[PDB]
Symmetry: D2
Subunit: 346 residues, 4 copies
C-alpha cells in the first residue's frame, strides 16, 4: 500500500536564494572583481595570456575567521606576482566523501551534526562577499545542483570534482555556470572523461533546476566556452611533461583547448602534503624548458601545515592535509620566477 517517501525521515524549511541575496547583495567592487577575473581566466584558458592561474588555499573552509586571515596574507602575494601569476583563493564549502563524513561548512556549519544548512549558506555567502570586497577572488567546487544559486555570483572559477566529472548533471550544471570551470580527471586517472566533459559543458542543455525564489524549473543553458581539464593524478601521478604532452594531443584531437591545469595535491602528491612542493618544482622545470600547455596549478595550502580530526588548532585543515604559510611563500616564489621566464621567451 504505502510506496512514497518510505525512507524520508523529514523535509525541512529552506530559505530561498533571494533571502540571502537581499541581506548580502553583491557590491559594486565585488561585481567588478568577479567580472574581471572571469575574463582574465578565460584569457588564460584560450592562450591569449601566459600568466599562470593559481588556485590556492585550504582543502576545506571550516572557520571563516581563519579564512579571512589567510586571505589577507595571500592578497599581498597576489599583488606582488600579478604580472606572472593570477592568484585566486580556494574557498571550498562542499566536500565529496569516500563513503561518509563531514560534507562541509554549508551542509553542517557547526561541525557537530546539526545540519544547519540555512546558517551554512548564509555564512558561506558572507565569507565570499567579504573576500571579494577585500580584493581576493574566490573559487569553489560545485558539488550540489541547488547550492550554486546562493553564491555563484561571487565565484571567479569553479571546479567539478574527480568523482563527478563523468556525471551528466554536473556537466549540465557547468554548461550554465557564469564562471570558467575546470574538470578533474577520474579518481583512477581517466582523462577522457574530463575531455568529454569540456565537450558536453560547451553545448547548450536543458535540465531541471531551482530558481532564485526556491522553485523548480526548467533551465536552458547557453553552454560554457571556458572549460579546461585538471590533471590530478590517478593510480599513478600525471603531472610530468610526458603526461602533459599526451593530454594536449588528446585535447587537440577532441577540438578543445589544449591548455590545462595541474593539481599539486591529492593523487599527484600521493595524498602527502610534503610532496606538493616536488610537483610544483617539476612544473617550474616544465615552464622553464617550454610548458606551453600549462595555464594553471592547484595547491592545498593553509595557515598551519598538516591536518587534524577535530577543529582544535586554528588555521589547520580538518580534511586533506595542507602545506603551511611558509611553504606557500616558497612555492609561489618558485612558480612566479619560472613563469617570468616562460613569459619572456614570447
Amino acid at each position: 500500500y504505502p510506496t512514497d517517501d518510505i525512507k524520508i525521515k523529514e523535509v525541512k524549511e529552506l530559505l530561498p536564494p533571494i533571502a540571502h541575496l537581499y541581506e548580502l547583495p553583491i557590491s559594486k567592487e565585488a561585481s567588478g572583481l568577479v567580472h574581471r577575473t572571469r575574463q582574465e581566466i578565460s584569457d588564460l584558458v584560450h592562450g591569449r595570456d601566459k600568466r599562470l592561474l593559481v588556485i590556492i588555499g585550504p582543502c576545506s573552509i571550516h572557520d571563516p575567521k581563519a579564512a579571512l586571515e589567510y586571505a589577507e596574507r595571500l592578497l599581498k602575494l597576489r599583488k606582488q606576482y600579478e604580472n606572472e601569476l593570477l592568484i585566486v583563493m580556494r574557498v571550498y564549502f562542499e566536500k565529496p566523501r569516500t563513503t561518509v563524513g563531514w560534507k562541509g561548512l554549508i551542509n553542517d556549519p557547526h561541525l557537530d551534526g546539526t545540519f544547519d544548512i540555512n546558517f551554512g549558506l548564509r555564512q558561506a555567502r558572507s565569507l565570499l562577499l567579504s573576500l571579494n570586497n577585500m580584493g581576493m577572488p574566490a573559487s569553489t567546487e560545485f558539488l550540489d545542483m541547488i547550492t550554486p544559486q546562493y553564491y555563484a555570483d561571487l565565484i571567479s572559477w569553479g571546479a567539478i570534482g574527480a568523482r563527478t566529472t563523468e556525471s551528466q548533471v554536473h556537466r549540465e550544471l557547468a554548461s550554465g555556470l557564469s564562471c570558467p570551470v575546470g574538470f578533474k580527471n577520474g579518481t583512477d586517472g581517466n582523462l577522457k572523461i574530463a575531455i568529454d566533459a569540456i565537450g558536453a559543458a560547451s553545448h547548450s542543455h536543458h535540465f531541471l533546476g531551482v530558481t532564485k525564489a526556491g522553485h523548480s524549473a526548467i533551465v536552458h543553458t547557453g553552454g560554457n566556452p571556458d572549460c579546461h581539464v585538471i590533471l590530478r593524478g590517478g593510480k599513478e601521478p600525471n603531472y610530468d611533461a610526458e603526461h602533459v604532452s599526451e593530454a594536449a594531443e588528446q585535447l587537440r584531437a577532441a577540438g578543445v583547448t589544449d591548455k590545462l591545469m595541474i593539481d599539486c595535491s591529492h593523487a599527484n602528491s600521493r595524498k602527502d602534503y610534503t610532496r606538493q612542493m616536488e610537483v610544483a618544482q617539476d612544473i617550474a622545470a616544465q615552464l622553464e624548458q617550454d610548458g606551453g600547455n600549462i595555464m594553471g596549478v592547484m595547491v592545498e595550502s593553509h595557515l598551519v601545515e598538516g591536518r587534524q580530526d577535530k577543529p582544535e588548532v586554528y588555521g589547520k585543515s580538518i580534511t586533506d592535509a595542507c602545506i603551511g604559510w611558509g611553504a606557500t611563500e616558497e612555492l609561489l616564489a618558485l612558480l612566479a620566477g619560472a613563469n617570468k621566464k616562460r613569459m619572456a621567451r614570447a
Copy 2:
C-alpha cells in the same frame, strides 16, 4: 557588473509532481505490486530467497506502445517462471551519454529536440502506471535529483549508473529512495566505488531537494538498507566466477551484502549484443555449480533485435543494441532451468 546567469539562455515553467500525481494517481493494484516487489527484491538482496531477479527490457524507452506490447509478452514469462525468477521490466527514460546525445523520453519525448519536459514526465508516469496496472513491475535508472519525485512511487527497483556511482549527490538520493537500488561498477571496472556507494547510501543524509509541490527544501533521509552492487564490465568483462568471488570477498570485507547482480550487456558483452546469451550461459553454469553470491541479472532486450539510428522500425532500440524476442525466450528458459537446480539444493 553583470555576474549572475551569464550562460543561462532561459528559465522555463515546470509543472510540479503534484500536478502529475493528481491526473495519474497510483491505483490500489499498482500500489500493491510496487510494495510487494520491493519486498521480494529486498528478500533477494539479503539472501532470504534464492529466486533470481531479472531486470530485462529495452536499453531505452522511446515508444510507449511498443513498451506495452513488450510488457504483455514478458508478463506471460514472468508468470511462467515465478518460482525461479522474479522478472521486472527495464523502463529506462534517462540515458547518460559519453559526450553529447539524446538524453531520453523525459528530456525530449517528441524525438525532434524540442525538450518538452512537462509532456515527457507526464508520458513517463502514464506508461509506468499502465505497466504496473497490467501486473508488470518496473525498474529505471535515476540520473537526475528532481525527476524521481514524479514517478519513484511506480518503481520497484532503481539503478545508479556507472557514471554516477561515485557521485555523492547520487548516493544521497539513493539513501532516500523507497526502492532497492543497484550500484554499477565504474566504466573502467572499479568495484570499490560501488561498494563505497552502498556504504554511503545505507546511512541517513541531509541534502537539498525538491518537494512534491515543486519547492526546494532540506531533505533528511533514513538510509537505504537494500542496495547492492552490479557487475557490468570494465577494461575487461567481470561476469565470470572468479570476478564474482573477488567481488563477494570485497563486499564481506566492507560489511555489506555479498549478493550481487550481473549485467549481461554493456561492457560485459562488448561489441556484440548476442554475446548476452554467452554471459547468461556462463551465469547458468555458475548457478548450477554453486553461484551462491548471485541474486540477479540484467539483460537488454526488445521486440526486434539490434539497433537503428532513427525510429524507423517498430520495437527496435535506438540506443544500445538489444537481443530480440526469440533470444529472450531462450535466455529466460536457460536462466530459469539453471536456477531451479540452485534452489533445489537447500
Copy 3:
C-alpha cells in the same frame, strides 16, 4: 507561543498552471473572450447601444444543467444579437450573510468536504466548454487567488455589494482583463461604487499569487472599463429618477455615466416573480429615453424558484430564479424595447 494557533490545517493546493495545462484555452474561446470584452467596453463608454444582459443562475451547483441552460440561452443570444449582448451568469463564489455553502469552488460535492482542487478543476472545465460552444461567461470575483485559475475565460466580472467598498477588491479589479461592474452597497449606498470605479481605473501594487502558485508583488495598469450596478438598497433603485440621480453623480466624479440595473436581489425584494416587473420598468425607460442604461442583470434557471437541497434538476439552491419560460418573455421584452432606443441615434 503566538503563531498559527487558530489554524486547524494547511492543505495542498494545485497551482493554476496545473489546471491550465489540462484545460488550455482554445483559439475559439480566446477569440470569443477577447471580442466580448471589447464589445462590453463599447457599451460601457456609450459607443454602442445594445444592452448587455448578464443572465443565468444565482449560483452554479451542477455543471450539466448549466450546460443545458447555456444551449437554450445561446439560441436567444444569437437571435437578439443586434439588440442584446447576452452573457451567461456563471457564479462559482457566493457571499453569505453569516455562513453557508460558498459555492462550487469552495465545496463542489455540496456536502462540506471542501474539495477545492476538484472545484477549481470543475469550474474551469465548465467555463471552457461554455466558451467553446459560443456562450461567454461572467462571474463574481470574491476571492483574491481563485481568479488566476479561470479569469482568462471570463468576459465580464462583478464585485459584489458586500465588497465594492473593499480596497483589495478594488485592487483586484484594477488588474482584471475583463470589464467589471461594481454593485451599490447592501443598504443602497451608491458612492462606494462610484469611488470603486475611480480606484480600479488606476494602477496599483498589491500582493498576489502567480500562476505557479507563489506570492508575489503584482503591479496593475488599471481597468478603464468599470461601471456601476444598481441592485437596490433599503428601497429599490431601478427607476428613471434613481437612474438619473446616479448618472449625474457619475458625471460629477468624471467617470462613465452608463450603468447596469439588476432586476433581482434588493430590486425585486427577493421575489423572483418581480424581476419581470423591473424589466418592464426598464423596457419603458428604454422606449422613452434610457440613455444611461447599458445593461441588466437577471437571475434565471431552467426551473423557477429555489430549494434547500439539490433535489430537483435545473432549480436553484441559492436565490430563487425565474424559469425558462419567463426568461424567454423577459428577453423578448428587452430586445423589443431596446430595438426602438437604438433606432433614435
Copy 4:
C-alpha cells in the same frame, strides 16, 4: 491572461523576515498574555477598559517609537484601570486613491518597496513589544498577516471590509482577538454577522509562511467583538450602546463592545474625540456595563498634513496631540476606577 498587469515582482516570503527578526521570548510572553487579557475583557471576566490608542497611520518608525515610549509610562501608571495597547496601523484604506501606508510604500514617494516596508513593519513591531508596548493593527490584506501577526495582540477589521466574506474568513483564523467596525453609514448588523461568521471554522485559499498558496482551514475566532465608530450620525452615547447590546444578545454573541472616539463619532473632527471620551466616562460612572474598550486617534502633535513635513504629525486622519492624550487617558482611568469599585 494579464491584459492589465504591468509587472509581477520579487516578494520575499514570511520566513525570510522571520529568520532575520525572530520573535523574542519576552515579545512572545507579552503577546500571549495581552491576547488573554483582552479575551477576558471581551467575555466579561475583567472590567478594565481596553484602550487602543495611537496614530491613524504609522509613516515614521522614529516618531512611533518616541510616541510608544511616552505611552508606556501611562500604560503602566493606569494598569489597574486600563489595558493600553498602541495603534500600529500600516495598511490604510482610501476613499478612492492615495498613499496606502508604510508597507505598501515606505519611502512615501511612490516606489512601492514592499519588501523593505514589510521588514520595517516587523522590526518596529518587534522593538515595540520588546520595550513592553503591545501592538494592534488593521488587517486589510490576506497575505501581509503572515509577516507579523505573531506580534499583534489585537486586530481590527475596517468599516469598509466588515461585510466582506474573505475578511471574515481571515479573522476566523487570526490568533488575536478581533474587533469589527460597523459600516461607514452606521449599519451595525454587518458587524454582528461578522462576529457570527468569524467564530466558525472556514476553508479558503491563503499563503504559507514559505510564500506558497495553499488551502487554509481555520478553527474559528471566539474573541471577536463589535466597534461603534459612527455612521451618518454618531453612535457612542448610552442609548446606542444599550440598543447595540440588546442586538448583540439577540444574536447570541458577546454584548461587550468597543467605542471609537474618532472617525464618524467625532464627525471627522479631532477636537471632538475628547467630548466622546467624556460621554464614555459619564457612562462608565453611571453604569456602562457593556463597554469593554475604546479607540483613540492620537499622536505626538495634533492635526494632519498632506506631506510629512512636521515630525509626529499625522498624514492621514487628524489626531489629537500628546497633551490631549494625557488628559483623555486620565479621564478614562478615573471614571473606570469607579466602575470597577462598584461590584
